[PDB]
Design a protein around this ligand. Structure first.
Ligand SMILES: Cc1cc2nc3c(=O)[nH]c(=O)nc-3n(C[C@H](O)[C@H](O)[C@H](O)COP(=O)(O)OP(=O)(O)OC[C@@H]3O[C@@H](n4cnc5c(N)ncnc54)[C@H](O)[C@@H]3O)c2cc1C
Ligand SMILES: Nc1nc2c(c(=O)[nH]1)N[C@@H](CNc1ccc(C(=O)N[C@@H](CCC(=O)O)C(=O)O)cc1)CN2
Ligand SMILES: Nc1nc2c(c(=O)[nH]1)N[C@@H](CNc1ccc(C(=O)N[C@@H](CCC(=O)O)C(=O)O)cc1)CN2
Ligand SMILES: [Mg+2]
Lengths: 827, 310, 103
């Protein structure tokens, strides 16, 4: 097995060494600038609260695994997990409602939990002043990790298995050759490596600069305080660090708590964000590192803590008879989206990161990475953890600083899934942006792009819209970042003609004599067809899991345009093209460009699409002139355009691509031509609803690498007859009909109760799935939701979806819900 | 017809990312190559009441006054004494990339381009008789990637064919691709003696002489936008050409615009631009020299490294 | 219905002379008496990163948060510590004139 160096002996790096060893990779050296007995990173000060429930399925699985692993990690009969359970309390109605949504996550992810009344909260946690408690969420399997003890036991058993640990060793650079890592520099020389994994916690950006990699984490300080002995607690717990009560979250006041014997530990996010310059920390001599003197602990700032102390005394009056004993401002890592940073760097083959990871998720992250290193894939979907998920504007130090500090300020807030940041905004805009503002676009952002969700100009259409198209009132939650205007935009798309801004769709140009060869190997399609063909196709991993679903348009012999899913795809293609180029001939070279930012696209869709475009083009747009799923170059309003005939909304028309400088003209030309046909601009809310009526899958929610194409109902997109492609061998024998889990379309029976995503789905009172995508279907006039379900459940069966604690009846329905004969699309 | 007379149609075919902001500032647009180019900005009329009389030109006759305005004098004034933002987006922009890129450019141009990345070089393209086909800038952005500021689509086609020929007849290490990226990117010329004062408000990068020397390039972040900054100025003042992707352009513009308010920043158009560059003696290919002239006749000897092997 | 809920139509019946400038500043408009009235300006979102934490209000519940925004806190902040321009155009304005006016 390859030579591995791990940088960092925190809870992450030692768990990784361990997970690798159990997989038979023990040629490992772990380095840490601190002493092995107390390395002095964040792991050396964490209080160790482990709350498993999380809106993210992957984070929740990492947490469940960490709990299981720490419970089994034992010496002298004492494990590294004290399973006292966990309790989140609500002091506002808003929080009470949110706990019901969290109870849904728990059921969805297989975590047992209960909602408690105020009385039950008092029975479980008598120190609570019940006067402001409205309810609690109790998860009996949560508890306290002994993180620093776990590190020692992990070092012990991996050492026994051959792993080498070198403490008091500072990494100062990374050695490389030919675009691949070769070693790790220290003052005493170079340590050779075939693989380096940076598990350096909040030092991660500093390690990244060593190879020119941007690591989007910000070191931030967070206050942690221990009280003096609390009189009410006298005699109750083992000294000095015993605990018997569930760990306690008070998210309304940004606080959490645990016992330390008869003292309390208080964690506060109820202070200003406190960025830390790691370069000013100073080099700690290993022999000087102790409990109150380590790089991760900065001086306590009492002034910042006073409001938290007042709120603490209100929640837990017994603590008012104690005082603050010791505090510190403890450093750890935040990221722009709260997700960790895992995977292979873009800059250097063989260099990996596993950084910005809570103790809560540590073992799960280590397991995923060990699967990635040893098999080439993680058994858990890393779509929201991969370092390559970020767009270029999202990796600047300024964006990382601003958004991570906002993540810290909002860490415990109740937030709607569509809630945008208010800053930074307007980073990336399409060429149509001025016209969109004229039309009163409501913009939300993703990947740095400003995306209209609907247009206030279209409000004027609701007075004319048939009542059959008007949806019922929404509740306050599902109504946030939604508008009845979306119904009018769906209406016009289905009955007239609409212009959607598809500019933000990731757009990759793969060119060169080795382009076809590259794509033939990576995708599930036979792409060797004369230019002009558009093909919907998947990218699999070696296990057959779905890495991505994309379109490939062959624009010429050696040039293909891909509609991809984001920067994970971009980095995937970049590395694969580089590898093919390096090891191939003069006829295998291939270049990959992300052209999204330099180009634009209008989705011109609806039954009057031909009537409109024929006013501004002399090209032939009839079925004879351009068949479904074909592309050709045309001129529209004087602008050279690549037109592709397909429609994620299920209507007649084309995606119209051109260079950014031409975009506004193309837009204006179409806009003017469309006036007699009642053309409108249509935003993402209508777009998402329409595509769900079509049953089209969205990568990252509807399927991920945890699913094969047959489970996801995407068998049609896999040409099993191909001679070769990544994942083919893994798929041999598989069919949709024999799949144990299948992605199903649900419609909500009451016509009214809209769900949003992640809600657990029940069949015969058992949790058997969860909502992946959902929207109100304006054409079918009811809410729609998709969920994997046991292959046993059939079309026509009834299921319940739990939404804020209420069961909503839904029916498994055949898809597409709209135009299954494709009469709107084809011909 | 006057030499500047524009068509009234077709117009607005190609516009830079700053186009909405330019209209807000009452840009007077003329077109070339399909691009709408501000010649000056009516917003700057307000500056003439404040301008020193030494900067006010005499009346123009009717002919030389067509497609001209006294506003250009105020824009020249502010460029020379404050800080101005010019739209350089229409400058032909070619990316020459691949392992055979340096080899291609070494043969076609009159410069030694084999220098560590970051160098910007003003250089000529000659024909076999020594006549001047073009005058361009070459910025070496990385080992195998160069950005060229070219003179138009005659250059583009010249490079396209030459790259194809080299690729066809060369090895696995001679291949080279040429892309015209003008339409996908943008550029602001940020020039004048207060240029550093302005940009340092919106960037943590080092823009002092130590951080970026004359005729060098490096990547920076300005107003949150990744930018390639090149230190040179066809108007003869301190500051940089700031390049970025089209989708980022408006943000970069707005960031700079806001930073520049206390320094009296203005948008400046092509009339001032042409006058300032003539005060600098900088040549314009196609009028000041063509293939009928050699570099020495045109006063461009300095740009020809006669010591090159080939 | 929330007490601030606006109609979506008819709208823009009466607008002040500053209306173009207000749209430039991303005004969120509600109507009363036919007049379009900014309730706050999205341009001012940019000020929240600079605002002292003492001025930042706690989260609102869903109901009291409808037709409200944290941006209002920044606008109050600047009015109390700097200078603000409010559009008072919709204030009913009557001219009473003639020799019997004072009487
Ligand atoms: C006050 C506080 C309270 C917290 N509470 C909780 C909680 O209740 N629950 C929870 O799940 N998490 C909690 N955390 C978070 C947590 O502790 C971290 O997320 C976690 O410990 C990170 O582990 P790590 O192994 O990635 O990094 P670290 O433990 O920081 O270890 C990584 C390191 O690499 C070494 N290193 C860095 N650079 C170099 C170099 N150049 N050469 C050699 N070695 C190097 C360091 O010396 C160090 O040991 C808390 C954190 C703080 C600060
Ligand atoms: N450019 C383009 N590329 C893209 C998308 C897009 O919006 N347009 N969106 C993403 C992927 N998605 C889809 C999903 C379904 C279809 C589609 O059209 N499916 C039809 C036809 C499939 C074909 O016969 O293989 C079928 O009925 O399922 C097109 C893109 C990313 N790639
Ligand atoms: N990117 C960039 N590329 C370009 C132009 C530009 O506007 N910016 N304009 C065109 C060519 N022109 C010039 C002419 C002179 C200079 C210049 O700066 N000359 C100084 C320095 C020359 C150097 O020492 O070699 C000297 O005093 O003559 C830069 C571009 C097309 N290429
Ligand atoms: Mg907070």
């Amino acid at each position: 097995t390859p030579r591995i160096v791990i940088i960092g002996a925190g809870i992450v790096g030692t768990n990784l060494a361990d997970e690798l060893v159990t997989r038979g990779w023990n040629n490992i050296t772990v380095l840490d600038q601190g002493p092995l007995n107390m390395p002095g990173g964040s792991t050396s000060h964490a209080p160790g609260l482990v709350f498993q429930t999380n809106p993210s399925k992957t984070m929740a699985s990492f947490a469940k695994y960490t709990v299981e692993k720490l419970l089994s990690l034992t010496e002298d009969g004492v494990s590294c997990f004290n399973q006292v359970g966990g309790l989140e309390v609500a002091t506002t109605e808003t929080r009470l409602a949110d706990l019901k949504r969290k109870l849904g996550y728990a059921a969805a992810w297989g975590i047992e939990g209960r909602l408690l009344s105020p009385a039950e909260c008092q029975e479980l946690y008598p120190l609570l002043d019940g006067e402001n408690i409205l309810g609690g969420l109790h998860v009996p399997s949560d508890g306290l990790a002994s993180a620093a003890r776990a590190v020692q036991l992990l070092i012990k058993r991996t050492e026994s298995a051959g792993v080498t640990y070198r403490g008091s060793t500072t990494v100062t650079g990374i050695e490389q050759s030919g675009g691949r890592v070769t070693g790790v520099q220290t003052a005493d020389g170079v340590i050779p490596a075939d693989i380096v994994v940076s598990c350096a916690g909040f030092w991660g950006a500093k390690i990244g600069a060593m190879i020119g990699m941007a690591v989007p984490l910000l070191p931030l300080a967070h206050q942690y305080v221990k009280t003096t002995p609390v009189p009410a607690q006298q005699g109750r717990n083992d000294q000095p660090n015993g605990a018997r009560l569930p760990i306690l979250r008070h998210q309304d006041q940004d606080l959490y708590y645990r016992e330390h014997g008869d003292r309390y530990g208080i964690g506060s996010y109820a202070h200003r964000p406190m960025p830390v310059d790691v370069d000013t920390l100073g080099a700690y001599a290993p022999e000087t590192v102790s409990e109150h003197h380590m790089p991760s602990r900065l001086d306590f700032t009492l002034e910042d803590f006073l409001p938290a102390w007042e709120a603490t005394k209100q929640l837990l009056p017994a603590l008012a008879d104690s005082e603050i004993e010791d505090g510190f401002n403890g450093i750890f890592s935040f990221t722009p989206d709260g997700g960790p940073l895992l995977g292979e760097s873009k800059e250097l083959d063989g260099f990996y990161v596993a950084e910005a990871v809570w103790v809560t998720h540590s073992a799960g992250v280590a397991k995923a990475m060990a699967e990635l290193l040893t098999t080439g894939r993680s058994e858990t979907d890393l779509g929201e953890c991969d370092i390559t998920r970020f767009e270029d504007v999202q990796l600047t130090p300024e964006y990382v600083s601003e958004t991570s500090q906002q993540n810290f300020v909002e860490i415990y807030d109740v937030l709607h899934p569509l809630q945008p940041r208010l800053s930074p905004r307007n980073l990336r805009v399409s060429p149509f942006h001025a016209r969109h503002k004229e039309l009163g676009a409501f913009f939300l952002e993703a990947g740095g792009w400003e995306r209209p969700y609907w247009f206030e100009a279209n409000a004027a259409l609701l007075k004319e819209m048939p009542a059959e198209w008007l949806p019922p009132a929404r509740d306050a939650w599902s109504g946030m970042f939604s508008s009845p205007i979306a119904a009018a935009e769906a209406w016009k798309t289905r009955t007239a003609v609409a212009m959607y801004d598809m500019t933000p769709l990731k757009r990759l140009e793969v060119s060169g004599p080795g382009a076809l060869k590259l794509l033939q190997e990576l995708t599930t399609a036979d792409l060797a067809k004369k230019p002009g063909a558009v093909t919907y196709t998947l990218l699999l991993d070696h296990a057959g899991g779905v890495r991505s679903a994309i379109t490939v348009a062959r624009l010429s012999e050696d040039t293909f345009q891909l509609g991809a899913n984001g920067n994970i795809d971009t980095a995937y293609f970049e590395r694969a093209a580089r590898h093919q180029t390096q090891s191939g001939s003069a006829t295998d070279w291939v270049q990959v460009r992300d052209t999204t930012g330099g180009t634009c696209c209008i989705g011109l869709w609806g039954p009057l699409a031909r009537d409109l475009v024929s006013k501004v083009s002399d090209d032939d747009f009839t079925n004879d002139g351009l068949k479904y799923f074909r592309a050709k170059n045309v001129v529209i309003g004087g602008i050279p355009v690549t037109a592709m005939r397909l429609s994620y909304v299920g209507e007649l028309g084309w995606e119209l691509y051109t260079s950014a400088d031409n975009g506004q003209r193309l837009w204006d030309a179409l806009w003017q031509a469309g006036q007699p046909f009642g053309v409108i601009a249509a935003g993402r809310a209508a777009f998402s609803s329409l595509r769900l009526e079509k049953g089209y899958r969205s990568w990252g929610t509807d399927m991920t690498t945890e699913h094969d194409p047959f489970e996801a109902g995407l068998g049609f997109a896999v040409k099993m007859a191909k001679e070769s492609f990544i994942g083919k061998g893994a798929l041999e024998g598989r069919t949709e009909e024999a799949s144990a889990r299948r992605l199903r379309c649900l419609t909500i029976d009451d016509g009214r109760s809209i769900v949003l995503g992640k809600e657990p789905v029940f069949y015969k009172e058992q949790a058997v799935g969860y909502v992946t995508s959902a929207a109100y279907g304006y054409t079918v006039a009811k809410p729609i939701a998709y969920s994997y379900l046991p292959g046993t459940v059939s079309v026509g069966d009834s299921v319940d979806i739990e939404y804020f604690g209420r069961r909503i009846t839904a029916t498994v329905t055949e898809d597409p819900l709209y135009d299954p004969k494709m009469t709107r699309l084809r011909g």
